[PDB]
Design a binder for this molecule. Structure first.
Ligand SMILES: CCCCCCCCCCCCCCCCCC(=O)OC[C@H](COP(=O)([O-])OC[C@H](O)COP(=O)([O-])OC[C@H](COC(=O)CCCCCCCCCCCCCCCCC)OC(=O)CCCCCCCCCCCCCCCCC)OC(=O)CCCCCCCCCCCCCCCCC
Lengths: 171, 70
């Protein structure tokens, strides 16, 4: 069959978010609140196109919007964020409940210096609507033509001509 | 009297104390002064392997914070 089309290695170069998972988990709710729109544009494009190769640029926007998220933490609130993700980082399951006072200090410093409200219980799991300018994929499965069905039954049912027609039976 | 049985109970209790203290201290020694990462589910293992790749030194427990970005 045909040749698969891989993008170049230059099309895969982006400035990586080189932080650990406890840094991401400590900043997760404010990341979902602030970096909402390009993340949801990317995931809409990702569930609609069903191809990562059709989703690179929006993905780069995700990797563009995460970094601007962290710099805006790193400029203003590096101390409560560091003290909070260290405590998140201690736990082997990375519990939020072990770290509520560092969470409260990080939320206080962020709400004072940046005005970000942490999302309540239920908010980040909502199904949201996304207004994009890319087109809807008309054939996302790349399906070819389907076979035509067999012709249906039509016409009023007349009796059997001369019955069963079984060898000598007249009905 | 009944406190004559307490040396054997003390020896057996120290021997029961040893494995949990040992695994706690060995987990903190082998994982950067912290608990061992618990990966029961594939998302936790995914984040753990991401940590092992973003640390640069092939160790998930080497944490990287805001200093690793500009
Ligand atoms: C106003 C509203 C009301 C109006 C009412 C109008 C009517 C008034 C009268 C009321 C009564 C009507 C009766 C039914 C209509 C006539 C049917 C008829 O004669 O068909 C002839 C039928 C076909 O001949 P035909 O000349 O081409 O057709 C004449 C008509 O057009 C036949 O018409 P058809 O072409 O439309 O027939 C359709 C088709 C015509 O047939 C075919 O297309 C060919 C296939 C027929 C079957 C062949 C099977 C062969 C292998 C098995 C053989 C078995 C052993 C033979 C018997 C051993 C002893 C029991 O029939 C069948 O396929 C059905 C099978 C045969 C049943 C006939 C009726 C039996 C009722 C009483 C049963 C009593 C026992 C009878 C003996 C048991 C065996 C039947 O003759 C045979 O098959 C030969 C065997 C005789 C059959 C039975 C005759 C009925 C009278 C029996 C009285 C004596 C009983 C003695 C005691 C018991 C036995 C010891």
């Amino acid at each position: 069959p045909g040749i698969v089309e891989l993008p170049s290695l230059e099309d895969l170069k982006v400035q990586e978010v080189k932080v650990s998972s406890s840094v991401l988990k400590a900043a997760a709710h404010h990341y979902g609140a602030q970096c909402d729109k390009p993340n949801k544009e990317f995931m809409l494009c990702r569930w609609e196109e069903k191809d990562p190769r059709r989703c690179l640029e929006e993905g780069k926007l995700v990797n563009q919007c995460a970094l601007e998220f962290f710099r805006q933490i790193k400029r203003h609130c590096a101390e409560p964020f560091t003290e909070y993700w260290t405590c998140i980082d201690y736990s082997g399951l990375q519990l939020f409940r072990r770290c509520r006072k560092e969470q409260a200090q990080f939320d206080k410093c962020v709400l004072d210096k940046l005005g970000w409200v942490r999302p309540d219980l239920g908010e980040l799991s909502k199904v949201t609507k996304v207004k994009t300018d890319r087109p809807l994929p008309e054939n996302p499965y790349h399906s070819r033509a389907r076979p035509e069905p067999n012709p249906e039954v039509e016409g009023d049912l007349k009796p059997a001509r001369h019955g069963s027609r079984l060898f000598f039976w007249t009905m | 009297m009944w406190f004559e049985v307490l040396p054997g109970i003390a020896v057996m209790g120290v021997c029961l104390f040893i494995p949990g203290m040992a695994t706690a201290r060995i987990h903190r020694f082998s994982n950067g002064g912290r608990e061992k990462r618990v990966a029961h589910y594939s998302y936790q293992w995914y984040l753990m392997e991401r940590d092992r790749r973003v640390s640069g030194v092939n160790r998930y427990y080497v944490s990287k914070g805001l200093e690793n970005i500009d």
